[PDB]
Every structure is written in C-alpha cells, then in structure tokens.
Amino acid sequence: ESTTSEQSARMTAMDNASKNASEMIDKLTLTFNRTRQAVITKELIEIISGAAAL
C-alpha cells in the first residue's frame, strides 16, 4: 500500500513542480525581453541627450 501511495504522491508532486517551473520560465523570459529592450533604449537616450546638449 505504501509504494502505491508513494508513487501516487511523487507524481502529483513533480507535476506541480513542473507547472511551477514553466510559470517561472514565463516570468523570467518576459523579464528578460523587457530588460533587454529597456537597456538599449536607455543607453541610446543618454547618448542623444548628451549629443543634443552641446
């Protein structure tokens, strides 16, 4: 009875873990694209601001 209860529980557990992970991959991926875009934009605005100020 223990093995069936063990394996049933491990499945369910790795299942949640696997879903939590995919959710972590989405937040991170989206964090990554937004940050990459903002770094280029920000660096460029600093360049232009200094250029135009002359």
């Binding site: 557990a13 873990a17 992970a21 601001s49 135009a52």
Partner: protein, 466 residues
Amino acid sequence: TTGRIVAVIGAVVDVQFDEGLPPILNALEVQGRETRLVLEVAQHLGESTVRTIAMDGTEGLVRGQKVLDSGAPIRIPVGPETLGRIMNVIGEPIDERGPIKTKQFAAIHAEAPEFVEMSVEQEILVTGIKVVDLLAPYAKGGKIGLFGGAGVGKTVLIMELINNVAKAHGGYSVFAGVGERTREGNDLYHEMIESGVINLKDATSKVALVYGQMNEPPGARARVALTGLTVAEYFRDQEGQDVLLFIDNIFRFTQAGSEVSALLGRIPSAVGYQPTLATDMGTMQERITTTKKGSITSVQAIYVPADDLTDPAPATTFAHLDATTVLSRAIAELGIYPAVDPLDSTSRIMDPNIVGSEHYDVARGVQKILQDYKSLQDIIAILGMDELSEEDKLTVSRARKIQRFLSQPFQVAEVFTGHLGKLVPLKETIKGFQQILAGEYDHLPEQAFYMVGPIEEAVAKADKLA
C-alpha cells in the same frame, strides 16, 4: 502694462513688453478671448521678452495678440465662501452657481512655512482599516501618501478614508482633483450633495472642491494642486482650524511639469523628466503641512507609472511623507483588498513610546512572520510545501491567515466584493493579530479570515464553513 505674443508652442507662450517687464510668477491676461486666459510668467528670456505657461488652451492665439500684466500672481477666493463650491485652477466657479463672493483672495504661490513654524506633536489618527492602523498608522495633522499603479485602489481607499475619518471630523475639508476623471468629480459632488456634506441651500457645507482634471492642458494640471492647497492654507491659518486636505492625484502635477519642461528649453533629466522635478515637488509639498498655527491632515493619492516604484516621481515623493500606504497589483490580483503591501507601508509614528508596546510588538511580529514567509516562498517556488519542515509549515499557515485577515470589505466597495463594509476599532485589530500569532486559531481554515471585520467574524465564518 501691455505686451504682445511673439511665439506660441502648445502651453508655452512668449510675450514681449516695451515697458515694464512682469516679474516671474505674475499672472498675465490675454486680450481678445471669449473666456479668461491666464499666462503665468516663468522666465525672463532677455530682450524684454518673457516666457510663460498658459492656464488654458492656446488654440486661436495669433502673434501680436495683446496681453496685460495683472501686477500679481494668480489670486483666488479663499474663506468660507469656497465651501460647497467648485473652483478651477484660476479660482473661477465651475459649478454654474454664480460668483464666489469672498472678502479675501490669496495668491496660489507662497513661501513654505519656515523651520520655526514646525510642530512636533505626534498623535494617532485611527482609520478603522486593520492593515493601516496595525502596521503603518496615520497621524493627526500628518502627511499620508497612497502609492499605487493604475486601477489598484488609490481612489477607493481615499473614499473609504473620507467615509471613516472625514464625514465625522470637526472642521473643514478641501478636495483637490488633479489630473483625474471629471466623471469622478461629478460622482463626488453628487454624493456630497446627497449626504448633506455639501448643502446648496444653507451655509452649512463642510468641503471646498477644486478641480483640474485629465481633460485640462498641462499648465492647468501643473498649478491646480497649488489652488487646492491655497484654500487649505487659509482654513489652516486664517482660522487656525484643523482641515483635511485630499489630493487625487498629486503625481499628475509632476507629469504636467514634464509636458512643458520640453517646451521650456531645458535639457531633460532621467526618464525624460524635467531636471527640476525634485525642487518643484519640494516647493509645493513644503506648503502642504501642519504648522504651530493650525493643522492639516493631508491624504495624497500617488500614481505609479508602469508600476515602477523607482520611477523618479513616486521615488522622490517618499521623503515628503509621515505615513505611506503602498498598494500592489500582485496583491490585488490575489483578491486581497485593500491591496496594501504590508512590508512596504511605513509610518514615522510606529514607535512603542507613541503607540504603546503592545501595538508595537504585535505589528513587528506580524511583519516578521510575513517576511519569514516571503523568504520561504522564494525557496518553495518550485517544490511546494511538502519538502518544507513542519515548523516552517507553521510559519506558512499562520502567515497565510494573517495576510487574509489584513483584507477587509470597505463600505464604498460593496458592489465589487458583494460584502457589507466593516470598520474595525484599533483595540480589536490588535487583539485579532495578537491571537493569530499566539496560535489561537491554528485549527481554522485560511478562508475564514478572508474579507471580514473583527476576529469574531473569522470564527463565525469558520463555523459556517464547518
């Protein structure tokens, strides 16, 4: 003395004077307009030309159009005759009820109260909102800021504070609508007329309304908070009496400033903002204050752009406050209202010599358990609570109950919660969190502490759930 427009770009108008230049801050009047059009002097450009900011739209202006100098800054009606009325940025009636016949007028620009005028008295202002009173309590005569991203609950929280504190407050109130929805201004006005807080027949009104909403051009949104605060100053001083000042939303002052800063010729600072962001903010904020002459309890909704609390606007506002209530979208999306971040809301009055050691020890224990939980979450992210250790299992279950008991149905939100509103007295907010922390309800389900008032309501709801 009269001048002539030499240039017009949106809200910024240049004006040349052949005789007598108007000093910075003077209100000038454009001739030949159907409705009064004020230009506030901002700079002296040289060559007898000044640079100004318009208080209304500049469509229809022509080069050469005449302008007169009024000889002073924008001046508005102040005093008992503003009560029950609605005024705009230049002090004109916008409620169709005729002239505002005061005896007094006040300039909307003024030096802040000096260091010698500061008061150091600190006393609690109980709101009946559990999360605020427990963790980051408001002070009478103090500065309160409500930070929040778009649609997270700042206005709803303001309206609940008006309902729990104001309505039954000794003195007068001033509500300054700044860059928000005109229809919210129509909602407020109607509700105050329906309750009698505003009376269109007697001299009994208790609130003065000042509005410059999101339909206005930037110069009007950049000055309308000064109009509201000027009305509040008069009641503070010129009566010495305890006024409530609500502003929704003060971020709109700083946003309006960034729209004209470009037209003014400045090199932009970080994030495209005006280089003067912090000193402009400071000259306005330092007048919103309790002084030895009289008290102002101010409550200011503070918008947070792209939900970024590090944006220069919200970030520079923190220093101007005595209590901060920070709302979070994540929390709102979990259905916890009011959506207050219990680990980012603070108060200068949360000191055991002021609120007593029991309030202080319970608030610190709630924050410790919620931070302990936050810290576990970070390590459970993937593997749930199974792998967790029974004692940590106890931090989790308690923290989860505390988070829900911080939720609370507001009288003004019944349509969204489908729950009658609740006001919880200070002593009961303390007892309930004291009990949860002591383990007195480790056997009740989480759900029972959600959306209730006092702790006896969680217990009932527990039975009902069975």
